[PDB]
């Protein structure tokens with residue numbers, strides 16, 4: 001029964017066929033249980049350890065690597081590992097990384113928090129029901145509660161199901177619906193049906209929501225829905241459908257890895273098409289075991305060269321360093337891959353109060369009717385100092401610090417503020433000054449009561465402890481508060497009913513004190529107030545009253561206005577049904593206006609400029625607030641979303657206006673709208689979806705467990721450092737200080753991260769493209785293996801992974817925020833940018849080929865047989881008498897291999913600086929700028945020399961030391977690569993445009 005808020009209390013018991021006196025029979029429980037299931041959100045079907053391991057080994061690139069150790073292992077048992085006990089190491093190291101990477105891939109998951117599981121806190125364990133089999137109440141398990149059940153609740157209890165209320169066995173009933181919205185004010189419940197069947201939850205004044213707490217009182221009710229059909233259950237199935245996509249970089253890497261696989265195979269087929277010349281060999285003689293191993297030893301070597309094997313830890317470190325870096329900037333990033341998407345944001349939907357504004361309201365202006373004499377009108381406009389909730393401040397009539405008690409209309413304006421108020425103050429000594437006790441809007445009134453000191457009470461000898469509750473108190477002493485007609489949104493006002501103290505300071509019976517939205521209250525006003533006199537509400541005064549209201553609420557003051565009024569002859573107390581909010585507006589009719597108060601939720605200091613940063617960075621900002629559209633647009637002009645004289649008729653909509661549009665014109669609104677006023681949580685997801693339909697990367701704020709669906713649906717769900725736990729666990733970022741400028745500061749660091757990830761991603765992929773060249777030459781020309789895979793692994797992790805994890809520390813750009821947001825479908829490599837690194841990749845491939853083959857065909861220690869094409873290594877059998885002018889076994893040697901591995905290191909430390917800018921030269925950008933990078937290049941060398949000396953390592957790598965002079969033909973070959981890209985860089989600087 002999902003419509004139970006619009007049915008009469010008798011209509012619901014009729015629908016279920018239950019007696020409020022009996023409850024469900026045991027047979028009725030049986031049937032309703034099978035029809036509706038149990039009262040629980042579905043137990044999530046998570047993953048296990050056995051599945052996680054397969055996830056780590058389903059990835060293409062780890063699959064290609066996994067195969068590359070099932071071939072290196074074959075070539076270890078089938079290769080004489082007795083002459084070289086360093087043989088079984090090549091297959092063993094490969095597995096050791098797929099194992100370590102798999103281990104990293106899972107402790108990234110045990111800690112990962114599910115946002116849906118955080119909803120299951122608001123599942124209480126127990127609940128009280130009444131059924132047929134027993135006359136007393138039964139505290140049964142909450143999951144066993146079924147719709148149609150008669151259920152009891154009281155203070156402290158957590159509501160276990162969506163409940164329609166039947167009888168409120170207390171003088172009042174109050175509910176803490178803060179988990180839903182994030183608010184902090186208990187709401188009064190009634191029992192009359194709510195007419196609108198399609199009405200929102202804040203208007204379901206007769207419903208009890210599963211998961212919310214009972215603030216006051218005790219009441220009985222019938223259960224409308226259970227499980228996933230509840231209001232919070234309706235939200236779980238909204239996240240369970242949310243397909244959060246991969247970050248753009250993830251799609252680039254997925255597309256790169258998809259292309260890197262098809263590219264590796266492209267070369268493997270090419271090699272067999274070069275040694276399709278070995279297809280014309282005799283059947284005898286040539287050991288096919290020697291030929292097949294050569295191809296397989298080349299294949300396990302080929303795959304290692306292509307895959308950036310340090311990049312998974314290079315990235316997941318660069319991100320984690322910005323994570324700690326942002327935590328000092330108050331940005332708490334929860335999802336590591338989101339530090340990249342955080343910089344691609346183009347739309348930022350931010351709630352107004354708390355983040356854009358300080359949520360510290362205080363009244364700035366107020367006025368009374370001064371004179372009504374014919375069409376002539378006179379207002380008594382005042383102004384108030386003070387921005388905190390402190391009684392420090394004073395009233396100023398044309399800057400005369402006036403004594404407020406002098407004006408009689410000000411004393412009535414103050415009694416309304418103190419009495420028609422469910423908020424107060426209190427001495428705060430935990431932190432030194434004052435703090436709001438209630439609602440921000442109502443507390444601003446009680447503070448106004450203090451600054452006025454309307455009765456000139458003691459002001460000199462006031463201890464700043466019993467302060468702030470002083471002029472309020474002396475007003476509560478006069479009129480006794482009988483009951484309150486709470487604020488509802490149909491009539492947009494609240495009221496209190498008061499009798500006097502009945503002593504010598506009595507009055508004309510009782511009084512009603514009304515406050516609310518100006519238009520509604522003013523319409524119900526049939527009289528005014530001139531000090532203590534009273535006049536019929538006339539046409540001019542209404543126009544003059546409302547004119548100032550628009551000046552105050554629409555002008556550059558951007559004030560929230562409240563029209564205060566009192567009913568002088570209210571109905572007799574016995575004639576008011578206080579169980580029907582629909583009859584409250586009738587009770588608040590025939591009023592007399594007394595004044596209007598104007599308060600300001602002031603914008604934050606850093607907010608004013610952060611909007612302009614978004615303008616410079618091409619980021620559209622959308623405000624979302626509960627202010628009326630007239631004042632919403634007013635605050636947007638104040639912070640810079642709009643220009644003070646700019647038409648925005650089709651660029652700012654309310655909740656009612658947005659739905660009256662057909663789905664087509666809704667999509668076009670979000671493309672242009674920069675402000676929404678008085679929306680429903682159902683619109684935060686609709687706006688995200690429409691902003692997504694324009695391929696726009698959207699940031700969205702939120703606080704409640706009903707902002708959670710939009711937080712999930714958004715590319716970057718942003719939560720509050722004070723929001724409910726569910727909103728945080730459903731977010732990719734938490735503002736530790738509830739501030740908007742934190743978002744802009746986070747978007748800045750996200751670009752500084754990527755703009756440097758741009759380099760090392762291109763720079764490691766350039767070295768891999770370079771190593772693959774070195775293998776292909778050692779394969780076509782059939783040279784002795786110039787780089788064994790065990791050496792290539794050390795390079796692609798350590799001797800390269802420290803320069804790569806330093807380019808992240810590059811100097812941030814100055815125009816870093818003067819450039820528009822980066823596009824998602826921006827391709828990995830440009831046509832030029834690909835060609836550039838192919839030329840560099842081709843060079844470094846033909847230099848390790850040098851050192852590990854120039855150690856022949858022009859060497860001192862090596863053969864140096866430059867005339868005779870050596871090439872054939874294990875091909876030589878007895879073809880060496882006088883054909884090979886010496887021996888036949890130093891083809892394989894840890895002396896040429898240690899020469900290529902040596903030059904590659906020095907070569908890749910050079911490229912670690914060409915990837916410091918991108919187009920500008922080193923004549924302009926010297927290596928003096930990244931000293932973090934410099935002091936690390938030495939370390940990889942000291943490790944390179946550590947594998948060229950220390951006890952076991954040289955044998956492990958099939959490398960031996962160089963000479964104090966053999967570095968001659970290392971730098972003679974390596975260092976030229978700096979000028980190579982510097983040549984390619986002058987192409988773009990002075991002779992290329994876009």
Ligand SMILES: Nc1ncnc2c1ncn2[C@@H]1O[C@H](COP(=O)(O)OP(=O)(O)OP(=O)(O)O)[C@H]2OC3(O[C@H]21)C([N+](=O)[O-])=CC(=[N+]([O-])O)C=C3[N+](=O)[O-]
Pocket residue numbers: 181182183351352353354441487489492493494515516560562624625626627678703704
């Ligand atoms: N359909 C609507 N009709 C009228 N008002 C709406 C409507 N929808 C929202 N609001 C108003 O907006 C204020 C809350 O919205 P806003 O300040 O933007 O955000 P929130 O406080 O809700 O918390 P959060 O945004 O999650 O951090 C409320 O204070 C008040 O009336 C409410 C309020 N209230 O009970 O909600 C009581 C009140 N008095 O005097 O009793 C004065 C308000 N006011 O002046 O704005």
Ligand SMILES: CCCc1c([C@H]2CCCCN2CCN2CCOCC2)[nH]c2cc(OC(F)(F)F)ccc12
Pocket residue numbers: 056059060061062065097098101105253254255256257258307308309310311312
């Ligand atoms: C980063 C370069 C590409 C690359 C991928 C791609 C291929 C397309 C599908 C998505 N993955 C990225 C997901 N992986 C899962 C395993 O943990 C690291 C992240 N998977 C690699 C594995 C590597 O193994 C190794 F151990 F060598 F790091 C190396 C590079 C890649």
Ligand SMILES: [K+]
Pocket residue numbers: 244710711712713714715716717730731732
């Ligand atoms: K999300």
